[PDB]
From a paper:
Gilteritinib is a selective [name] inhibitor that inhibits both [name]-ITD and [name]-TKD mutations, and is classified as an ATP-competitive type I inhibitor. To reveal the binding mode, we determined the crystal structure of the [name] kinase domain in complex with gilteritinib. As expected from the computational modeling performed in our previous report, gilteritinib bound to the ATP pocket of [name]. While the JMD was clearly observed in the overall structure, a portion of the activation loop including Gly831 in the DFG motif was disordered. Asp829 and Phe830 in the DFG motif adopted the “DFG-out” conformation. In the binding mode of gilteritinib, two hydrogen bonds were formed between the carbamoyl group and the main chain atoms of Glu692 and Cys694. There was no distinct interaction between gilteritinib and the activation loop including Asp829 and Phe830. The crystal structure of the complex formed between [name] and gilteritinib was obtained using the kinase domain of FLT3wt, including the JMD, which has been reported to bind to the active site of [name] and to stabilize the autoinhibited form. In the complex structure with gilteritinib, the JMD bound to the active site, indicating that [name] adopted the autoinhibited form. Gilteritinib was far from the active conformation of the activation loop, suggesting that it likely binds to the active form of [name] as well as the autoinhibited form.
Author numbering: 571 to 633, 637 to 648, 651 to 710, 762, 781 to 830, 837 to 951
């Protein structure tokens, strides 16, 4: 069964487990987002999962013509409804510079299309990896700091909107013009562990997610720490050379944290470590993180 990894939550109490997920299934879709099918000229496939795909297209008159990314299902009615819920969620969220924003949708006369902003340089993980020889076209320490700042800003927006990202990682951040980055939502991949219905990004998950299935904004701070390690290693797999097995679960339970990656300063590393506090209440907030990285970045000589 399909589900979006960006989820709205409502808090029902002060403890981490006191919340529920907001289902938009019973809410009505605002028809001002509806865009004509025939104004999409489909180009190439950008990625496929089991339940769907993201395709490049030219969109005529959506903003004049622009590139877009179009999310769609593969050729059930439950899958259709989940995509509508995601659409309804994204219509209500509002836009932000550091989110992959919804531009429109095609829902009435054919298969469901969700039309998003196109991010011409693809995912941040592959971007970082392609720049390893070209680190001083050229990638710098300041660019890495800027990417970190932008992701934190994106997450601060999601915190403010009462949302959680259940899969924050460099693979789910995209890169567009001007070194702008944007947080996106969405078997062969060894970073996800199969466990019944679930596909778990184990090495990105906070303990309370691993052990109790709890996802809060503070779980996202942990994942953000992992993503920082990805940035400042130029896209190394977290916990490099450590397999995902029952020993991994024990390592995390006992307070195992990664070392300082090569491109991190000591100050960036202290921030990473704070994100990995076992107790969620000791982790910094996203407004804290934007302040710390903004101050680090503001040291551009
Ligand atoms: C909603 C998920 C998603 N949204 C977008 C989006 N809204 O725009 C998106 N775009 C995207 C854009 C461009 C590329 N390319 C092609 C050119 C290539 N070249 C290499 C050679 N070099 C010299 C010049 C650049 C760099 C990668 C791309 O990767 C194929 C994806 N992709 C999304 N999902 C995928 C799932 C599979 O994994 C990555 C993310």
């Amino acid at each position: 069964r399909y589900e979006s990894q960006l989820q709205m939550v409502q808090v029902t109490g002060s403890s981490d487990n006191e919340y529920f997920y907001v289902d938009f299934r019973e809410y009505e879709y605002d028809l001002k987002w509806e865009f004509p099918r025939e104004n999409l000229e489909f180009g190439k496939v950008l990625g496929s999962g089991a339940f769907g795909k993201v395709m490049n297209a030219t969109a005529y008159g959506i903003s004049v013509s622009i590139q877009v990314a179009v999310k769609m299902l593969k050729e059930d009615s439950s899958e259709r409804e989940a995509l509508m819920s995601e659409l309804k969620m994204m219509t209500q969220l509002g836009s932000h510079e550091n989110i992959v924003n919804l531009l429109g949708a095609c829902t009435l006369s054919g298969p469901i299309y969700l039309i998003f902003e196109y991010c011409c340089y693809g995912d941040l993980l592959n971007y970082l990896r392609s720049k390893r020889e070209k680190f001083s076209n050229v990638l710098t320490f300041e660019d890495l700091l800027c990417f970190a700042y932008q992701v934190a800003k994106g997450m601060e927006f999601l915190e403010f909107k009462s949302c959680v990202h259940r899969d924050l990682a460099a693979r789910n951040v995209l890169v567009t013009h001007g070194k702008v980055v944007k947080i996106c939502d969405f078997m062969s991949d060894s970073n996800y562990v199969v466990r019944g219905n679930a596909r778990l990004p184990v090495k990105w998950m906070a303990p309370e997610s691993l052990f109790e299935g709890i996802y809060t904004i503070k779980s996202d701070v942990w994942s953000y720490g992992i993503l920082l390690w990805e940035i400042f290693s130029l896209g190394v797999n977290p916990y490099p050379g450590i397999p995902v097995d029952a020993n991994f679960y024990k390592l995390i339970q006992n307070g195992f944290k990664m070392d300082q990656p090569f491109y991190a300063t000591e100050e960036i590393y202290i921030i990473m470590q704070s994100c990995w506090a076992f107790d969620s209440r000791k982790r910094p907030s996203f407004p804290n993180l934007t302040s710390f990285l903004g101050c680090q970045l503001a040291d551009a000589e």
